[PDB]
Design a binder for these strands. Structure first.
Ligand SMILES: *P(=O)(O)OC[C@H]1O[C@@H](n2cnc3c(N)ncnc32)[C@H](O)[C@@H]1O
Length: 256
DNA sequence: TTCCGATAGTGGGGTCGCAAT
DNA sequence: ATTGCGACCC
DNA sequence: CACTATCGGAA
């Protein structure tokens, strides 16, 4: 019923009281909105799911994360986005981990309660609800994040209990993810496109372990002019690695 | 005063699907 | 059968 | 997804 989607703000952007938030593990899946009749992605591309996958689901609008287990994103994205054309029974171990309803004028605590009500009244086990728990100190958050990360999880999500749904980013829905640093030697330059015409678009870097990947973001516009010369070393941040061990969401930090 | 939230516009890894080879 | 490319997910 | 680079209004 609400127009735009409520996006999640990064943690560092100290001041919040965690006790006022529902905490839940961020599931590295595919976002999907349940139309009551149809599933659709973040940008409203139809998801071609089997009829049994949605059989007996509620007749309401629900936002959820199509998810199997931790560290199964690439495979999950292969099942969900592919057209369905009983072969293509790959949805067997997929679930719809609902986490919110886009209802206007009601606290997330109430929407969560409604979600749990809809699950008990739904015979299909594909319809699930993300587990919501409570933390106290910021230290408790840091330790839980570490544990989840080491256990293969992607991160944590914080949703304010007494907050109403509203599009955009705010402290009502916060996103928590870990990241590490690493070094790599630049092997080549790649010309940028669009506004970065005649400028550096990305760098073919390589890690000491022999993993090569293109580092294409994090540079200021001045850094793109006269970029790190080939043969030098650069430090980049990343959020884990892919199936092929390549850094994910990598961005440039500083040289040396 | 600073800082936040919203846009516009680049870039990656991975995958799917269609056009070109 | 191969390859390249745009458009999506993240 | 990550990011840089603006900009007007909220804090
Ligand atoms: P980006 O991932 O930066 O924005 C957040 C998205 O993550 C999805 N998501 C996955 N798992 C969860 C939970 N447990 N709670 C809330 N959101 C989650 C959302 O679909 C966002 O699009």
């Amino acid at each position: 019923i609400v127009d735009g989607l409520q996006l999640a703000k990064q943690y560092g952007h100290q001041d919040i009281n965690i006790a006022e938030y529902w905490v839940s593990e961020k599931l590295d899946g595919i976002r999907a909105r349940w139309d009551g009749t149809e599933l659709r992605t973040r940008n409203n591309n139809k998801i071609d799911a089997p009829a049994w996958f949605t059989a007996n689901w509620p007749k309401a609008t629900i936002d959820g994360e199509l998810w199997i287990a931790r560290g199964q994103f690439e495979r999950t994205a292969s099942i969900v986005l592919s057209k369905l054309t009983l072969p293509s029974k790959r949805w067997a171990k997929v679930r719809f981990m609902a986490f919110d309803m886009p209802v206007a004028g009601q606290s997330f605590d109430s929407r969560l309660n409604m979600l749990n009500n809809l699950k008990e009244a739904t015979p299909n086990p594909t319809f699930a609800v993300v587990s919501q728990f409570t933390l106290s100190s910021v230290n408790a958050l840091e330790e839980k994040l570490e544990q989840v990360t080491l256990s293969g999880g992607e991160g944590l999500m914080l949703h304010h209990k007494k907050a109403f749904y509203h599009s955009g980013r705010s402290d009502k829905l916060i996103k928590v993810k870990q990241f590490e640093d690493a070094e790599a030697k630049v092997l080549a330059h790649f010309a940028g496109k669009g506004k970065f015409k005649g400028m550096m678009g990305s760098l073919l870097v390589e890690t000491p372990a022999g993993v090569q990947f293109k580092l294409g973001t994090g540079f200021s516009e001045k850094e793109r002019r006269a970029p790190p010369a080939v043969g030098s070393w650069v430090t980049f941040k990343f959020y884990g690695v892919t199936k092929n061990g390549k850094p994910r969401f990598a961005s440039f930090l500083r040289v040396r």
